[PDB]
């Protein structure tokens, strides 16, 4: 159990371009293609990522690859961000994965926006961060996922994934 395994549970694996619960197009393991409604712009984003004509279908290996780069970018994003970095540094290993998970799903700037929730995590007020984490658009968008991540931060265990 780590970020790689946690994300696999949260995102699934699809070798064909798909729509998320918001109508956006993703592929592989949560790799965002485009928020534009056209399936063709999505195919286009795709061939540019891969470097080939894909017709909206990729190999599993290509999926794995993308995933690695994505997890790597989520970590880079936490490390260069002045608001997230001091938080991250302060967390144990389990909670760290919970933050990389939000970042992979919302981006550095989107997570950097959870001002109250980050103040609480930074101060080790786990119950109160969980409550603040729930008052968000994120949670109203993807509550089941958000609920598993918030339990991780609350508890510091892999309980919601087990």
């Amino acid at each position: 159990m780590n970020i790689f395994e946690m994300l696999r549970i949260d995102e699934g694996l699809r070798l064909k371009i798909y729509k998320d619960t918001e109508g956006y197009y993703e592929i592989g393991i949560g790799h965002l293609l485009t928020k534009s409604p056209s399936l063709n712009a999505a195919k286009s984003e795709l061939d540019k990522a891969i470097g080939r004509n894909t017709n909206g279908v990729i190999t599993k290996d290509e999926a794995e690859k993308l995933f690695n780069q994505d997890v790597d970018a989520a970590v880079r994003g936490i490390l260069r961000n002045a608001k997230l970095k001091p938080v991250y540094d302060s967390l144990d290993a389990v909670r760290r994965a919970a933050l990389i998970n939000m970042v992979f799903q919302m981006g550095e700037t989107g997570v950097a926006g959870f001002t109250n929730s980050l103040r609480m995590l930074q101060q080790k007020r786990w119950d109160e961060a969980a409550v603040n984490l729930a008052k968000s658009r994120w949670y109203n968008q993807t509550p089941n996922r958000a609920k598993r991540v918030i339990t991780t931060f609350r508890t510091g265990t892999w309980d919601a994934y087990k």
Partner: peptide, 4 residues
């Protein structure tokens, strides 16, 4: 997704 996405604090609002």
């Amino acid at each position: 997704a996405x604090k609002x």
